[PDB]
Design a protein around this ligand. Structure first.
Ligand SMILES: N[C@@H](CCC(=O)N[C@@H](CS)C(=O)NCC(=O)O)C(=O)O
Ligand SMILES: N[C@@H](CCC(=O)N[C@@H](CS)C(=O)NCC(=O)O)C(=O)O
Lengths: 212, 212
């Protein structure tokens, strides 16, 4: 297994947590987004979409972190990252999708570049943009954590799930874009509890080979 | 079941197709996005995130169309919208995630409103934005359809899948934003094949009760 990814990438960080929780070994292959190595014909051979991450399983190159992570859950049952019952699965998947659909893609490099080059945005306007979508997404996420009475230390129950895999990288991203997280005690408690776990610690951007 | 949705909403349309394919009956409850009925406290009681669609199952209100659809596939097995094998699953999920993560959310109403109100974007700039992310996502989607040797009429195999549930609304949106689809014959052929099916036809925005 070869993971084509980038240290500060939220989607890379997402897949790293899932892989580490499953204890699946993989070779770390850095694809430097700042250098735009993903925008080159060489990387297009691996991923036509030209985004990270991409996972070479040995037999094939897989794309889309959400699809890869669902794949890992089935290919590597232990520990389970999705609950067994329909209602629980739907809720974990919804919490994940708040991050995966409604926060992360909006703050992606290509988007911020568009805002800079087409809309003349300076860095303060970039940070105001990222904070808008994060705050909106975290508002909804936090509200959902509040109403779940059976919830323990993490997003759902008292074991780490897919939802935590999506949430942790997003909280890190929020801190990079200087998003004030005071209004989200519950998300911050989930993030800190996750931060105690080896799988999460090893996956963090600063622990990566290509870190600054 | 009650479906809180909007006729031209791409995610609403996505969910409608899945519900129609599963032959599951629901009450159509319109939530007018142009009137911003979703931004009112009344809708926040149903969905704290304040987006459409939301599905009241009688017993609970479900949010996040990707999660709801994965829920329907488990709850209502026939006809199968995900293949049986892991590699097939992952690939259908990846195609859906290109649309669900990397196209649709970028062109959402709230985002375009932000471009208008913060960056002073006019409609031509709005259309140039929307086409940028659609063309980028469709480039990758189309490339994947081309490299699948055993593909029939649809995105994967020769039965409709979740991927088609995501693709068709996106193609409709592409047409609303005047995106030139000449470069995507394979996507256009998948869409035309889907448009032959009762389930898709009934789900089309123009066929909805709150349509113009
Ligand atoms: N849905 C994709 C999203 C991939 C994605 O957007 N990756 C970002 C890194 S977090 C990227 O490659 N950005 C490069 C760019 O914006 O040019 C996935 O989760 O795999
Ligand atoms: N990930 C969500 C996305 C929902 C979403 O963004 N819905 C749009 C309609 S396609 C919406 O409600 N937009 C209202 C707005 O932008 O203010 C889902 O699939 O349920």
């Amino acid at each position: 297994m070869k993971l084509y990814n980038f240290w500060r990438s939220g989607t890379s960080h997402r897949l790293r947590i899932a892989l580490n929780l499953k204890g699946v070994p993989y070779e770390y292959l850095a694809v430097h987004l700042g250098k735009e190595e993903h925008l080159k014909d060489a990387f297009k051979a691996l991923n036509p979409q030209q985004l990270v991450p991409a996972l070479d399983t040995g037999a094939q190159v897989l794309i889309q972190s959400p699809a890869i992570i669902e794949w890992l859950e089935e290919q590597y049952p232990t520990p389970a990252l999705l609950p067994a019952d329909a209602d629980g699965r739907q809720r974990v998947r919804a919490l994940a999708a708040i991050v995966g659909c409604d926060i992360h893609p909006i703050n992606n490099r290509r988007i911020l570049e568009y805002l800079r080059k087409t809309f003349g945005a300076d860095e303060a306007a970039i940070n105001a943009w990222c904070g808008t979508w994060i705050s909106a997404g975290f508002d909804a996420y936090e509200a959902l954590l509040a109403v779940d009475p059976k919830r323990g230390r993490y997003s759902f129950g008292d074991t780490p799930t897919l939802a935590d895999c999506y949430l942790v990288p997003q909280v890190e991203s929020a801190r990079r874009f200087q998003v004030d997280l005071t209004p989200y005690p519950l998300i911050r408690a989930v993030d800190a509890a996750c931060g105690e776990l080896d799988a999460f610690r090893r996956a963090a951007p600063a622990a990566q080979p290509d870190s600054a």
